[PDB]
Structures are given as structure tokens and as C-alpha cells.
Design a protein around this motif. Sequence first.
Motif, PDB file in Angstrom:
ATOM      1  N   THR D 238       1.008  -1.102   0.022  1.00 24.55           N
ATOM      2  CA  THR D 238       0.059   0.153   0.035  1.00 24.55           C
ATOM      3  C   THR D 238       0.882   1.272  -0.008  1.00 24.55           C
ATOM      4  OG1 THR D 238      -1.806  -1.240   1.133  1.00 24.55           O
ATOM      5  CG2 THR D 238      -1.862   1.283   1.259  1.00 24.55           C
ATOM      6  N   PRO D 239       1.707   1.386   1.096  1.00 28.12           N
ATOM      7  CA  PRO D 239       2.541   2.604   1.064  1.00 28.12           C
ATOM      8  C   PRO D 239       3.364   2.755  -0.148  1.00 28.12           C
ATOM      9  CG  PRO D 239       2.319   1.858   3.111  1.00 28.12           C
ATOM     10  CD  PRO D 239       1.796   0.642   2.333  1.00 28.12           C
TER      11      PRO D 239
ATOM     12  N   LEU E 206      -6.469   6.647  -6.935  1.00 29.51           N
ATOM     13  CA  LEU E 206      -7.620   6.538  -6.247  1.00 29.51           C
ATOM     14  C   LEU E 206      -8.237   5.131  -6.273  1.00 29.51           C
ATOM     15  CD1 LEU E 206     -10.311   7.942  -4.932  1.00 29.51           C
ATOM     16  CD2 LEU E 206     -11.344   7.935  -7.282  1.00 29.51           C
ATOM     17  N   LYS E 207      -8.272   4.582  -7.229  1.00 28.30           N
ATOM     18  CA  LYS E 207      -8.704   3.211  -7.447  1.00 28.30           C
ATOM     19  C   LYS E 207      -7.639   2.352  -6.650  1.00 28.30           C
ATOM     20  CE  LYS E 207     -10.742   3.518 -11.933  1.00 28.30           C
ATOM     21  NZ  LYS E 207     -10.707   2.829 -13.285  1.00 28.30           N
ATOM     22  N   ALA E 213      -7.360  -0.800   0.468  1.00 26.94           N
ATOM     23  CA  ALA E 213      -8.329  -0.555   1.531  1.00 26.94           C
ATOM     24  C   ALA E 213      -8.905  -1.751   1.801  1.00 26.94           C
ATOM     25  CB  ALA E 213      -8.864   0.595   1.923  1.00 26.94           C
ATOM     26  N   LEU E 214      -9.735  -2.315   0.528  1.00 22.91           N
ATOM     27  CA  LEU E 214     -10.714  -3.561   0.642  1.00 22.91           C
ATOM     28  C   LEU E 214     -10.011  -4.811   0.764  1.00 22.91           C
ATOM     29  CD1 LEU E 214     -13.416  -5.109   0.054  1.00 22.91           C
ATOM     30  CD2 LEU E 214     -13.151  -4.354  -2.275  1.00 22.91           C
ATOM     31  N   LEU E 218      -9.991  -7.481   3.977  1.00 15.30           N
ATOM     32  CA  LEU E 218     -10.274  -8.843   3.497  1.00 15.30           C
ATOM     33  C   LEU E 218      -9.216  -9.683   4.072  1.00 15.30           C
ATOM     34  CD1 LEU E 218     -12.056  -8.638   0.146  1.00 15.30           C
ATOM     35  CD2 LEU E 218     -13.067  -9.007   2.321  1.00 15.30           C
ATOM     36  N   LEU E 219      -7.911  -9.604   3.472  1.00 19.39           N
ATOM     37  CA  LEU E 219      -7.054 -10.493   3.984  1.00 19.39           C
ATOM     38  C   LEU E 219      -6.508 -10.631   5.460  1.00 19.39           C
ATOM     39  CD1 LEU E 219      -4.851  -9.895   0.898  1.00 19.39           C
ATOM     40  CD2 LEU E 219      -5.881 -12.258   1.602  1.00 19.39           C
ATOM     41  N   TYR E 220      -6.894  -9.411   6.005  1.00 19.54           N
ATOM     42  CA  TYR E 220      -6.529  -9.486   7.644  1.00 19.54           C
ATOM     43  C   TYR E 220      -7.618 -10.301   8.247  1.00 19.54           C
ATOM     44  CZ  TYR E 220      -5.620  -7.921  12.200  1.00 19.54           C
ATOM     45  OH  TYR E 220      -5.261  -8.068  13.508  1.00 19.54           O
ATOM     46  N   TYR E 221      -8.870 -10.282   7.829  1.00 16.01           N
ATOM     47  CA  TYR E 221      -9.634 -11.261   8.401  1.00 16.01           C
ATOM     48  C   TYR E 221      -9.754 -12.632   7.974  1.00 16.01           C
ATOM     49  CZ  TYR E 221     -13.772 -14.144   9.220  1.00 16.01           C
ATOM     50  OH  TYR E 221     -14.710 -15.019   9.859  1.00 16.01           O
ATOM     51  N   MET E 222      -8.922 -13.095   6.742  1.00 13.65           N
ATOM     52  CA  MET E 222      -8.863 -14.513   6.481  1.00 13.65           C
ATOM     53  C   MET E 222      -7.610 -14.669   7.347  1.00 13.65           C
ATOM     54  SD  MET E 222      -8.912 -14.168   2.346  1.00 13.65           S
ATOM     55  CE  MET E 222      -8.939 -16.024   2.124  1.00 13.65           C
ATOM     56  N   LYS E 223      -6.686 -14.116   7.496  1.00 13.34           N
ATOM     57  CA  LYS E 223      -5.385 -14.198   8.308  1.00 13.34           C
ATOM     58  C   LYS E 223      -5.650 -14.650   9.584  1.00 13.34           C
ATOM     59  CE  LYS E 223      -1.726 -13.534  10.993  1.00 13.34           C
ATOM     60  NZ  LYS E 223      -1.924 -13.921  12.277  1.00 13.34           N
TER      61      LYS E 223
END
Lengths: 49, 55, 54, 380, 241, 80, 61, 101
Positions: D238-239, E206-207, E213-214, E218-223
Motif C-alpha cells: 500500500t505505502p 484513487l482506484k 483498503a478493501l 479482507l486478507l486481515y480477516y482471512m489471516k
Amino acid sequence: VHNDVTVPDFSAYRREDVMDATTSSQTSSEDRKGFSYLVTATACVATAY
Amino acid sequence: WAWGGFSVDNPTLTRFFALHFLLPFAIAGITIIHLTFLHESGSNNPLGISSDSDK
Amino acid sequence: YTADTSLAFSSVAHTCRNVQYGWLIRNLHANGASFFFICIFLHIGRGLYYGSYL
Amino acid sequence: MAPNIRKSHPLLKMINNSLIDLPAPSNISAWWNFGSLLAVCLMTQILTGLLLAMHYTADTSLAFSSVAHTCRNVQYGWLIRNLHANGASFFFICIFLHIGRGLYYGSYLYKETWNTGVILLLTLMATAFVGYVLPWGQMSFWGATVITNLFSAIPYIGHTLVEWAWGGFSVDNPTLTRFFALHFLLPFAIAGITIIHLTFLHESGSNNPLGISSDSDKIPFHPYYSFKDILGLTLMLTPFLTLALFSPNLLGDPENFTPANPLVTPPHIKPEWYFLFAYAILRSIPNKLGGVLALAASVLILFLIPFLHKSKQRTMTFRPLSQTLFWLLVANLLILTWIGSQPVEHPFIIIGQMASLSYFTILLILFPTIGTLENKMLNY
Amino acid sequence: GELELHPPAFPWSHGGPLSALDHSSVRRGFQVYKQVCSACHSMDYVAFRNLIGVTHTEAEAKALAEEVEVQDGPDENGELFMRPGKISDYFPKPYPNPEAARAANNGALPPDLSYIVNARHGGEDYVFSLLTGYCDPPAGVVVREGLHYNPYFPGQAIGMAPPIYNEILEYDDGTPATMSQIAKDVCTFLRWAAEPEHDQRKRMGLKMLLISALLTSLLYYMKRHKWSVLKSRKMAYRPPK
Amino acid sequence: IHFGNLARVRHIITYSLSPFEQRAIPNIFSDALPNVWRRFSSQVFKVAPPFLGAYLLYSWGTQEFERLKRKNPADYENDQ
Amino acid sequence: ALLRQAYSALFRRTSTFALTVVLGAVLFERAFDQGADAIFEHLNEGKLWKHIKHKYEASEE
Amino acid sequence: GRLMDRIRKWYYNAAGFNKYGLMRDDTLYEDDDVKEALKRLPEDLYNERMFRIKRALDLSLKHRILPKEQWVKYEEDKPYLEPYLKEVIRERLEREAWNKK
Ligand code: HEC
Ligand code: HEM
Ligand code: HEM
Ligand code: HEM
Ligand SMILES: CCCCCCCCO[C@@H]1O[C@H](CO)[C@@H](O)[C@H](O)[C@H]1O
């Protein structure tokens, strides 16, 4: 002796639906898995894009 | 697409030079795999019969 | 070498003409390519004739 | 031969024993995520790199504009160029944490894994150095001229070795070409050596924050770490992208938007950020020769770390003294970096020498000493 | 070291990470360059086609290039010759070689402006300050014959004589050509010449964030989801003691 | 073959639940944060110091440099 | 209950999970792009060529 | 006076390996000697250390520690391996010295 062995209490961590020890956990299973999988299925879609 | 244009021109020369520099190293990599599979069985021999009795 | 339609040809030429042993290296590389194929062709042949492909 | 193919197959077996069924300690932290990132980081440079190479021209008369023409005319050329350029920093940022982690957790005790590691660093440096000359901008050229000329201080074989490297009497076209060659080559050597690095690594298995045998609690790499690393990949990425996309030249010298010109020396010729720290130690020692050696030592010092471990414990998790000493050293490197960015004048010159001195003192004397003292305080 | 004055930070309409260039201001800028700077400043990397879909119409562009004669050739006899420009041509150089340029500007060499806002610390903020900021030298300071004082230019003695003054040209869009308006528009144009990807690059950023962020969440939850098995795991030591 | 030849372990029972019978991020306030803080406290006085001590040196060195660029009127007081 | 249904029809069978990821992507693209482009443009009203184009697009000479 | 004792107890608490339930000796880096040393530990002590160590790792992976009550107190930290390890080293130095003569 193994008879003197019991599984600790996971109330602190159990999900809402499987919190009550007297309710079939199977009924809320499809939800619990459908959610998590929903999250995953989404991650793929994002990645794919 | 491959030509990078409408005919073999400069944009081709460059991407070919790139490919020509690259590929050899892919060959070397693959040669390792080649010999890796090879070593599973060992070499074959002219008579075509099990050479374990005399290695 | 220089990869540019306007300099490629002459970069190679300039190599053989001005670079110490450039001519030799250029040759060895060029002819080396054939020696390569000659060899690979026999390597394959050998394999076919002795059923190494198994 | 065997039940499941993942173990029998001569190749899957490899992929399996190092990415799926590989025994990993259960308590490794985020600091262990840098290995995979360095790896990904590498695969990424090579990809963007090739893509840029397929449009580059290595010739003093065309380099600068070949790069420009790429960003200006090639579909997403601008993006690839950026990704590649900023990718190099993300690379070093990562390698510096990777090393740090190693130092603080005594990973270096895995000598061979560590020594190949130092080799990876050195190689990455050469690579990123030659890479930077390719766009043939003011800083590209001038930095190349000052940095390479350094060797001229080496006795007797000095000048010879440099004019050899240059392919002439000064950084000119024959240099640009051989550098482009080197730049294309080295990355691949990095990849190869990374395999050796992980090969030695696997002999012992990973180390862990508490520094004590983790055999009593290992877990399969997959999904635990495959997942953990994929997470750490997006957390850093990200960064990286945020920078690469919103503030593109936040890290680059504007002087490199000016085609190299041998008749205009820029005011302050300095290398890329990730080198400053050493450039700094270079100017600390007034004496062309000593300063070079000091430079060399600034990095080669890593080869000694393993022989300067006196603690009866592996990590610093339970060594508070060593801990401040460690963070001191980090801070010290930050300052050295800073000094490298400023001119050669008071009060910088002195701060420089001071930081350079504290650098070697900490690694050569304080660390092993405080280490011994710590053992006595434990009644060892 | 030495003394220097640093330009201020003007709130350019395109300073926002998510803010694009005001193409109208850019379109003006092109005129400023075309009618004033292009007289001594080369812009080698931009071509008339580049304007199309950015500041001008394919038609206007075709016209703007025909206003110039370029040097093509050789012909059947090996001679060089002139012809009216095409949109594929790049903005005309004002001088044959640098030597000729220096010669017509008192040995000074007006730099190509293709990447100027990225070649100088401060970019537009600097270029803008420089342009408007000319003035008389302070006490004790003497500018040698041929140079002009500008506190914003290092050394303060610059070879470029103030290039823009009120109404030095007329924006055909009906904009009050005050000196600052000019500098402002032209600086805006220079930003664009330096990096046409500006807008697209930001639109991508932007995209990138949104997806980023999306995807991260998601991958945080999965982890976490996988790890939960360990995180809550409980153990005990039960020797036959 | 690394799983099976690792260690001689005896008498340790462990209990764990499927990822689906439990929460991914549980007890954020009751356990999570309190520990985040805990961890943050235990370290600040080890890390922060030398980093702060760096900043200062930076600030001083910076400001002093600028100061030495300024002119000292005491060089021109007697230049009638 | 969608979660329950979703699970049954979409996430249970690996083959259908895949089909969902694809069609899901196809629709996500179409909507994510349009949306972002939309946001970017509003954020930049009157600055883009798309906006001022009309002035010279069949309204001059 | 008790200076040396003040320091040790301080450092012992400063180190903090006791918050994991570990003992001084549990943190020893397993070099060649410590390895031999451990092999000589009686089974009951070996199994215990193993649990302790495995428990510490689980805390680490969890980013937690034991409740203050359960922390190892400086004065109750049993030096279970030290005696063995010393003999292991005594032995080595003998051999090292003898092979030299
Ligand atoms: C009469 C020719 C002439 C005109 C017309 C002119 N310039 Fe220049 N410009 C120069 C010269 C001469 C220099 C070199 C000054 C030096 O390096 O001492 C210069 C330099 C510059 C520089 C900064 C150089 C530096 O080192 O910072 C910029 C930026 C610049 N001009 C902008 C402009 C712009 C924008 C315009 C049109 C508004 C313009 N110039 C018009 C001759 C001109
Ligand atoms: C980069 C080119 C290649 C290299 C460097 C390479 C190298 C080798 C080497 C070192 C051996 C072992 C010694 C020998 O028997 O020659 C070998 C064996 C073999 N190679 Fe290749 N090889 C190459 C290409 C190929 C190709 C094109 C084929 C056939 C399609 C092939 C088929 C085999 C087989 C079947 C063997 C087994 C030999 C036996 O019968 O015992 N090789 N190769
Ligand atoms: C091309 C650069 C490199 C790559 C891609 C690389 C990759 C890796 C990988 C994948 C790991 C395993 C996961 C981890 O612990 O992070 C690893 C571990 C390690 N690397 Fe590197 N590495 C690189 C550079 C270095 C350098 C410069 C050093 C140090 C001088 C080094 C030292 C180590 C050590 C000691 C380990 C052991 C980790 C532990 O304590 O368990 N590596 N590296
Ligand atoms: C080991 C990873 C790599 C690193 C650390 C690296 C680093 C760099 C650096 C720092 C530059 C200068 C960028 C700039 O500011 O303009 C650069 C440019 C370049 N690199 Fe790499 N590079 C790597 C690998 C590669 C590879 C493998 C290739 C392709 C075979 C490549 C091809 C180029 C080309 C063509 C340029 C010139 C164009 C440009 O400057 O953007 N790079 N590289
Ligand atoms: C972490 C993963 C980030 C990937 C984000 C994908 C965003 C790149 O998407 C790009 O957006 C541009 C703007 O409209 C379009 O013109 C390009 O065609 C499109 O590929």
C-alpha cells in the motif's frame, strides 16, 4: 487418569450462535461458513480485478 | 503485437535484444531440472539393460 | 552492442574492428551457436536410438 | 511409489518441503515477513525491469531520451518506469529491516545463511548502483564519475583498475553499455543466490523471537505463513503504491531530469538515499585511502557480527541493555544517513565523524562488551 | 554554505493528490509558451498531437502545426527542404545548436523546458516565483552587464530578462492577461509538459487506495480466521505425577 | 522429512476449536487493546530515547548551520 | 438468509465458488470502474477536457 | 553490603523472561555444551522445561504473558541445568587440554 480430563471453556471465543451448549450448532453452521467464505470469495474478486 | 509496430523496426530490435539476453539464463535454469529428473533414474546405456550390476 | 536500428550493425562492426579480441569473441560466439546445435542434434539422436526418451 | 504426489514428484516435493509442509515456529512475528517480501520484491524488479529494457537504448546519445520516450509514448511506460524506480527503494527499505531483524534476534548465528545474506546485500548494491546510471542524467553521470573514481586511491593498481572498469578515460559510452549489461545480469545472480540462502536456511529452520528451541511447537508453513506473508505483502505494498502513484519523485534528485553534461558539475553530488549512510562514513575520514576502507568496512563489518556474540542468549528479547544499544545503533544509522545528505561543512563534518565513530564502536566494542556484562548480571 | 531564498507554496489547482490539472489553464499556458517562451526555449519532447484531447481539438492541433515549417529530407537529389508541420512533429527548436543559442542570449543557454518543473526544486512554485519576482538588487550587490537581478535565482544574477509583462499577449478565451495570470497558466502548462500522465496517474491512485483498503481488510480477516485455531488454543501439563 | 524427528515431548495436552466455531478478532476491548497498550509501554523507554536524542542533534545541527549563514553586525560596526 | 443460501449455492461446491469469483469479478469491475471514474470527475468539475470540450467541438470558426 | 544482589535481582526483573514463566536456564542458547547438558537432565526435569518452553512460545505467538501472580520470582528461580552444564564444560576442557599435551 484421562477420566479426570475435561475441555476448557471456550465461551470467551465462541461465535454468538454456538454460545449455548444446548442448541444444535449445525443450524447456524451454513451461516458461519457462508460468511467467512463470503469474505474469501470477495478477496478473490478484488485480487482478480 | 510482437513487432511492437507495423513491421520489424527498432521496437523489435530492442525487445529481441532483451529476449536474447534473457532466454539463455532460462535455459540454464531448465538444464538443472533436466538433470534433476535425470538423476532420479540415473543414465541409460547402449545395451539397454539394467546397469545396476556394474556402476 | 547497441540495440538501435541506426547503430546495431555498426556497433557489431565497431566491436570486431576496435575492441581488443572483439573479432575473436564475435566469431566464437557466432560459430558457438552452430557447435551448439550440432551437439544438441546428436544428443537428441542418441536419445532416440537408445530409447532414452523412455 | 508413495501415496500423495506432493511428496513423491521430484519437483512438487521441492515446492512442498519449502512452502507447504515446511516446519515453521509458531511464534514468529512480523519481522519475519521480510524474507518473502524481499523475494517478491525481486521478482517484481525483474519483471518491470525487463519491460523497461525492451524500450531502452544504451548509448550516451540516446539513453536519456530512450527513457523519456518510454514514459511518454509506451502504454503504461510511465507506470512501469515508476514502479521499477520506486521498487528499488522498497527493496532496500525491506533489506534493511530484514538485516535489522537478524541482528536483534541473533539470526546471524546461522552463519552460512547469514554470510550468503551479506553477499545478497553486496550484490543488490552493485545492481542498484549500475541501474541508476542507465538514465544518463546529471546525477547519473556525475555520481558514477565520483563513486567509481574512488578506487583510484587503491595503491599501485588503482588507476589501472578504474580505467579498466570505465573502458576508457572517463565515464563515457563504453561504460554506459557495460553497466546496462551488468544491470541486466546481476539480478539473476541475486535470484540464484537467494536459492542458496534459503537452502542453508532450511537446514536449521527459522529462528524465533524468544530465541529458544521451537521444536516443541512447529506449524505447517501453509496456511499459517503463506497467509501471513500475503497479508504482509499488501500491508507494505500500500505505502509503496501510495508513494509511487501520488508522490512519484518524492525520493529522486531533480538534477536527474537534466541530460548528463560533462561541463557542469552539480553543486552536491551524492548517491541514492540507501547509500548515504556509507557515503557519510566515507567523508568522515579525511584521506582518500582511509575513507575508502572505512566505507568497505561499513558494510563488510556484517561478516564479523557472528564472531562478536558474547551473550549466553540468542535474542535481545531478554537483554534490555543490549536493546537500547541496538536502538542507539539504529538511530546512529539514521543520523549517518542524514549527514550524508548535507554538505561538507560545520557542524555536519564533526557530527559526521562522531556518528561514524559511534557506529564502529557499538558493533566492535560496546555490543560484545555489554553482552559479557549482561552474562555476569545473570550469574553466568 | 551560501544564501538563497526559497519560493512559497501556491495552492495550485492540481496540488491535491486527487486533484487534476485545469485543462483550461493548461490550454492558456500552451499559448503563453507558443507566443512568448518558444522564442528562446525548446520543448523537444512534446508534439502537436499531444495536445489533442487535452487542450485542443484534433483540428486546432492540425492547424497549430501547419503554422510551422519543419526540415525534412533528403529528396531525390539528396537536398534538405522545408514543409508545413504535421501533428506528428515536435515543437520547433528555436536554434540549430546550443552554441547558436548562447550566441543570441549573451553566452547564456535557455534550457529546454520539457522537464523544467521537475528539474528544479520547487517546480511551478519556483518557476512561478522566479517569473514574477524580478526586482532591483539590494545594497552592496552589483549585477554584471548583461544579467538581471532575481532574488529567486541562485546567485541572484540570471541571464533571462523578465519574460512576461501585463497584456504581453491576449488570451483568446477572454482572460485578463495580467502578468501573474500568465505565469500561473504557463506554470500550469509546464507541469503538464513535464508529465502528461498527471491526471491518469492520480485517477489510478484513487482506484489503488480503494482496492487496497478493501483487499487489505479482507486478507486481515482471512489471516485472523486461520490463525484463530492457535490464538485461542489452550494447553496443560498432565504428568502421571 | 522434518515432521516426526523434531522433539521428544511427553504429557502435554492442547485444546483448540475449528476456525468456524470462533471469532476472528475477539475481545478487542477486554483483551486486545489493553495489551496493545501494555506492549507499547514496556518498550517506549527503550526505543523512543535514542530516536528523540537523534531528533535533537538534527534540529541543533540544522539550526546552527543556518545561523552561521546569517551575518554578524559586529563585523561592520566600524566601517564608516 | 443469504449467508446460508450463498453458502449453499455459491460457496459449497468448489466449482461454483470459482464461477462466483469470475462472474463476481466481471460485475465488480464494471461497477468499481464506473463508480471511481464518477468520483474522480465530480472531484474535478470543469477541469477535464471532457468538460470544456464543447467550446471548440463544433462552436468555432 | 548487598550491591551485587541488588543488581542481579534488578537485571533479573529487567530481563523479564519470568513473565513468560521461563527460568534463567530455560533461556540458555543451545550451543554444543548446553545440548549435551540437556541430554543428562533427569526425565522429570526435561519434560517440565519442555512444557515451560512450549508454553512460552504459545504466549509469544499470542502476544500475551502470564498474570503477575504466576511470574517466576528471582529467589525461586531454580538453576536446574547449571550444575550439569558446568561438568560438561569441565569435561571438555580436560579433553581439549589433554589432546594438546
Ligand atoms: C529571450 C529568450 C528568453 C525568453 C523569451 C524566455 N527565456 Fe527563459 N531563459 C532564457 C535564458 C537566457 C535563460 C538562462 C539563464 C541562465 O541560466 O543564466 C532562461 C532560463 C529560464 C529558466 C530557469 C533557469 C534556471 O536555471 O533556473 C526558466 C524556468 C525560464 N527561462 C522560463 C521561461 C519561460 C516560462 C518563458 C516564457 C514566459 C521564458 N523563459 C522566456 C531566455 C529566455
Ligand atoms: C540445453 C540443452 C541440454 C543440455 C545442456 C542437456 C544436458 C544433458 C546432460 C548433462 C545429460 C547427461 C549426460 C548425457 O547422457 O548426455 C543429459 C541426458 C539426457 N538428455 Fe539432455 N540436455 C539438453 C537437451 C536435451 C534435449 C533437446 C533432449 C531431448 C528431447 C534431451 C534428452 C536427454 C535424455 C533423454 C537424457 C538421458 C540420457 C540417457 O539415455 O542416459 N536433452 N542431457
Ligand atoms: C536478495 C535478498 C534476500 C532475500 C530475498 C532473503 C530472503 C530470506 C527469506 C525468504 C528468509 C526466510 C523468512 C524470514 O525470516 O524473513 C530469510 C531469512 C534470513 N535471511 Fe535473508 N534474504 C535476503 C537478504 C538477507 C541479508 C542481507 C541477510 C543478512 C546479512 C539475510 C539474512 C537472513 C537470515 C539470518 C535469515 C534467518 C531468519 C531467522 O532468524 O529465522 N538475508 N531471508
Ligand atoms: C535487482 C532488481 C533491480 C534493481 C534493484 C534495479 C534498480 C534500478 C535502478 C535504481 C534504476 C534507475 C531507475 C531510475 O531512477 O531511472 C534502474 C533502471 C533500469 N533497470 Fe533496473 N533494477 C533491477 C533490475 C532490473 C532488471 C532485471 C532489468 C531488466 C533485465 C532492469 C532494467 C533496467 C532498465 C532498462 C533501467 C533503465 C530505465 C530507467 O531508468 O527507468 N532492472 N534499475
Ligand atoms: C492493490 C492492487 C491495486 C490495483 C488497482 C487497479 C487499478 C488500476 O486500474 C487502471 O485505472 C485507470 C484509470 O481509469 C485505467 O485507465 C486503466 O486502464 C486501469 O488498468
